[PDB]
Amino acid sequence: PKMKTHKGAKKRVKITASGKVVAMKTGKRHLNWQKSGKEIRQKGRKFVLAKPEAERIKLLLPYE
Template sequence: MPKMKTHKGAKGRVKVTARGKVVAYKTGKRHLNYKKSGKTIRLKGKKFVLFKGDARKFRVLLPYDWR
């Protein structure tokens, strides 16, 4: 059986914590920020835990990142 390949795009977008949660950054902070409030920009800089359904999809894309 050949080795499974890690999806490089998914690897750069999410991180799996020690307890197995999938964490990602919020979207919408790269550009066009002049029309957004400071509070919105600050909140978009934080990480958040993905929902179980989305995390399950990343389990397939990142086969070696699970504890």
């Protein structure tokens, strides 16, 4: 049968133009009050995943 896309993956990750995988930096969902402004802000930026894990994630989104 058709493979199914991992919905959890499609909700967390993005495939870029050139193949990279992209996600949101972890560690500002809570416990924020004491975290530095430098910390709090750097956790905005999307980050690129390291290839072996990115590549694995990729196989989970067959249709994109």
